[PDB]
From a paper:
SMC5/6 localization factor 1 (SLF1), and its interaction partner SLF2, have been identified in multiple independent proteomic analyses as proteins that accumulate at stalled replication forks with early repair factors, as part of a RAD18-SLF1-SLF2-SMC5/6 genome stability pathway. SLF1 is a 121 kDa protein containing a tandem BRCA1 C-terminal (tBRCT) domain at its N-terminus and a C-terminal Nse5-like protein domain split by an ankyrin repeat domain (ARD). Based on the high sequence similarity of this ARD to the ARD of two other DNA repair proteins, TONSL (Tonsoku-like protein) and BARD1 (BRCA1 associated RING Domain 1), the C-terminal ARD of SLF1 has been implicated in recognition of nucleosomes harbouring H4 unmethylated at K20, a characteristic of nascent nucleosomes incorporated during S phase. Our study focuses on SLF1, a multi-domain DDR protein that emerged as an essential component of the RAD18–SLF1–SLF2–SMC5/6 pathway which accumulates at stalled replication forks to facilitate efficient replication-coupled DNA repair.
SLF1ARD contains four ankyrin repeats (labelled as ANK1-4 in Figure 1C and D), each containing a typical helix-turn-helix fold, with loops connecting consecutive repeats. The overall structure of SLF1ARD is concave in shape, like a ‘cupped hand’, as described for many other ARD structures. The inner surface, formed by the first helices from each ANK (labelled as αA1, αB1, αC1, and αD1 in Figure 1C and Supplementary Figure S2B), creates a negatively charged binding cavity. The H4 peptide is held by this ‘cupped hand’ with a calculated interaction surface area of 589 Å2, predominantly involving ANK1-3. SLF1ARD interacts mainly with H4 residues R17, H18, R19, and K20me0. R17 mediates a polar interaction with N850SLF1 (right top), while H18 and K20me0 bind within an acidic cavity formed by SLF1 residues D881, N850, E847, W842, D838 and E808, with H18 forming a π-π stacking interaction with W842SLF1 and a hydrogen bond with D881SLF1 (right bottom). R19 forms a hydrogen bond with the indole ring of W842SLF1 and a salt bridge with D874SLF1 outside the central binding cavity (left bottom).
Numbering used by the authors:
A (entry chain B): 14 to 25
B (entry chain A): -1 to 0, 802 to 933
Write the structure that this text describes.
Amino acid sequence: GAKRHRKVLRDN
Amino acid sequence: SMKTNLKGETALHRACINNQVEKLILLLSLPGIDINVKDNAGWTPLHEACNYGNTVCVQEILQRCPEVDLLTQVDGVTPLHDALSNGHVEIGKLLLQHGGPVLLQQRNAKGELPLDYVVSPQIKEELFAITKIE
């Protein structure tokens, strides 16, 4: 149960 | 700013995720580099090294970047939360030796302090004992 970072996808 | 992937991760983030220590050392030597740069969600390269347990990457950041922010957070998750939640006690000791006890006082959005993730009373004692005294 390794907690990984939430991410946000965005290409500016 | 620097080039980013779709997550907003820079080469600094990628080096810290991938454990590319030699690449990281080069990047940390670049003029005007911002060690506290955030990806699109807000995570820093130090968060990534702590989350993945890349102890040498953490050591290099702490020794090569005097202005690294150890209290940066996403959802209240600081680097020390990241390290201890994933069991990376050695990283936790490095962070505390550099940052002092203010790191122990940070509650994340779920109201958790970093030591809440440590079950062993004796590990808690070692973490407190290595914490910088100002």
